[PDB]
Structure 1
Amino acid sequence: GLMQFTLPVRLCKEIELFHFDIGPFENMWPGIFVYMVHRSCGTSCFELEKLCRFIMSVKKNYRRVPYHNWKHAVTVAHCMYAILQNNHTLFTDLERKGLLIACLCHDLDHRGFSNSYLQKFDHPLAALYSTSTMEQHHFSQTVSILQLEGHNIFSTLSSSEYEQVLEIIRKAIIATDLALYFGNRKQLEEMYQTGSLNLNNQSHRDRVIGLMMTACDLCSVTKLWPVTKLTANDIYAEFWAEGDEMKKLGIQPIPMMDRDKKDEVPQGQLGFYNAVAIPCYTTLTQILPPTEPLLKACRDNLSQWEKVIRGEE
């Protein structure tokens, strides 16, 4: 109760900023997460014994893949922390509880392959979950870990608060399926423009929480150029492995996944920032003005990829 987590001064200051990188020391990431839960939620939200045990089980169930790994989980949770801390009064006690945990759990047991590769491989998960294959799996894994003895961090909630938080987490994790993002942002665009957006409407909050989840999930494009550039290598390491596996199934992969087409990456990053990232953080800033720094950083990095094409780097 009277035990705080404290960070070194540089982290204590830099963790509050959207562009914070969690660093290369794996053994500090759990404490970083707890630090963020205590400041975002309270010293009281979770039994520390239970939280710590949950955190290490979740870690254990992320795999040693180049991008969709434990560092990604904590990175995405930190971006949610920054959004929540810059939008204090907009979010309920349960939502701050649910969303940090949703972010930490959102890619549990990711194998480094897209839902498309699972479908074409005919993976058993593709027969169990026809759409949002991995995302339904990640939520399923979150519930399994919560039901490990001594792991139920939500035990102190009423029955109804419990059903609400697991519902917040389920919707939150499903929303990380980028195939659902396009329609979600367009609906939020019309609502904001026509003025029908209403955060007291639960179906509306759901959509807004989903956009936050896309924003946190894509947040590697909102870091300083050197972080963003070096994370790009990790995402492409998976994409190329997935392309290799498509060739093994006798299917020419899209250029994004073809390691024989590295030359097309700068242009592919332009398409990605223009088609996906810039619209995401634009709509998010319109709805949640204090999240503007993510849009600004995303723009700085689009400009960095333009310079790569032009030959200036």
Structure 2
Amino acid sequence: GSHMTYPKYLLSPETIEALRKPTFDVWLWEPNEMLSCLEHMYHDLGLVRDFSINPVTLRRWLFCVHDNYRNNPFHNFRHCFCVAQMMYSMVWLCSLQEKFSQTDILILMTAAICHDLDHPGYNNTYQINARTELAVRYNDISPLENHHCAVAFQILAEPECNIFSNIPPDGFKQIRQGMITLILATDMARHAEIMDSFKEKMENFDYSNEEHMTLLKMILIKCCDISNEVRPMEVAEPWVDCLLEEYFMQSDREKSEGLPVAPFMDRDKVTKATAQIGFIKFVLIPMFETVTKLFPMVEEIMLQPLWESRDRYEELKRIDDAMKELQK
């Protein structure tokens, strides 16, 4: 719509607008454009303003983050961007600036961006069963998430990437603790525990109770992390195939090294349709249902697409099933 053309890293006005919504097509963008988006979120949320973040430091920091994401089929830099972009979406959708401090929004955003740093593309169960250096390092306790987190603060300790350098020590310590809690909370082995605690608080929720608020931020980051299916189908569906790529890599290796294979990583047991129907019905919908009690607009903008997804996979399944009826 502009009188001249601009480089891609100069986000257009339409892109800036689109970036606030969960319909943003995360696939359209190169790393450099994604980096620009993230940068813009920090400015637009008032976090550069309120935390006195050096604007060049913010950029050096994001570039460093990018460099410490690996090129995995799924647990890559585009995935962290989805998680961040969904968090951003949720701030707008759920009017989170009315409810949360700027420090809380900083924690949410920074944890979202950092939460899968240097992921190897094999999960905690692989680490633990194979007795990897990481499992040994972290005593079989959320080995990956502990590493993501440590890498995060390693990056922030480099003075040219330290977006928190103009924050007082107490604020730093507060932000550090919140980020650790949040990144640790993304270990899916703790999903039911965290949901139970949340739901328990939801018996009588209190926005001025720090404990309630901590659980609400753990639930937000968990929402954002596993939210691909909330997105328009054409955006959502490619992510399942990337995840299965990663998972098949792992179960191949596990077979070959004599380690236990998860059925949901077994090429002969999983299908995309059946895996997603299960995850949608039994993990995603129920989680977003609880959140919808606090944020009613979540039903229309995030539950609806999930219902639509579930239904469409049910259709796909009827067809995978017929295909298998031709194959023995």
Give ranges in structure 1 of 5+ residues lacking alignment: none
1 CA distance for matches of 2:185 and 2:265?
A: 23
Cα displacement (A) at 1:85:
2.2
Q: Where does structure 1 differ by over 4 angstroms across 4 or more consecutive aligned residues?
A: none
Deviations 1:179-216 (CA, angstroms, capped at 9, x unpaired): 12211112222332x32x21211111111100001100
- Does 1:13 pair with 2:21? no
CA-CA distance at 1:94 after TM superposition: 0.6
- In 1, Cα distance between equivalents of 2:188 and 2:262: 17
Partner of 2:254: 246
**What is the DSSP-based 3-state SS (H/G/I as helix, E as strand, rest coil) of the residue aligned with 1:65?**
coil
Q: Is the contact between residue 11 and residue 33 of structure 2 (CA under 8 Å) also seen in structure 1?
A: no
Q: Which amino acid aligns with 1:10?
A: E
TM-score, scaled to structure 1: 0.92
**Cα shift at 1:222:** 0.8
1:271 maps onto 2:278 in alignment = yes
Contact 2:83 2:112 in 1 (8 A): yes
Change (3 A) 1:308 1:176: same
Distance in 1 between the 2:230 and 2:165 partners?
A: 35
User: Structure 1 residue 157 and structure 2 residue 167: aligned?
Assistant: yes
**What is the aligned-residue RMSD (CA, Å)?**
1.8
- Please name the residue that 1:214 is paired with: 222
Which of 69, 85, 93 matches 1:78? 85
Matched with 2:33 is 28
SS state of the match for residue 64, structure 1? coil
The alpha-carbon deviation at position 270 of structure 1 amounts to 1.3
Aligned partner of 1:290 in structure 2 is: 297
Tell me if the contact between 2:47 and 2:102 (Cα under 8 Å) persists in the aligned partners.
no
Secondary structure at the aligned position of 1:310 is classed as helix
- Give the Cα–Cα distance (whole angstroms) in 2 for the partners of residues 109 and 43 of structure 1: 26
Q: Which has the larger radius of gyration?
A: 2
Aligned equivalent of 1:99: 108
Corresponding pairs, count: 306
Q: 2:311 maps to what in 1?
A: 303
Letter in 2 for 1:248: S
Structure 2 CA distance, aligned partners of 1:181 and 1:110?
19
Percent identity over paired residues: 26
Q: Which residue identity does 1:161 align to in structure 2?
A: G
Deviation at 1:242, TM superposition (A): 0.8
TM-score normalised by L of structure 2? 0.88
Shift of 1:261: 3.3
The answer for the alignment partner of 2:62 in structure 1 is 55
Which amino acid is 2:108 matched to? L
Partner of 1:228: 236
Q: Are the equivalent residues in 2 in contact too, given 1:181–1:211 (CA < 8 A)?
A: no
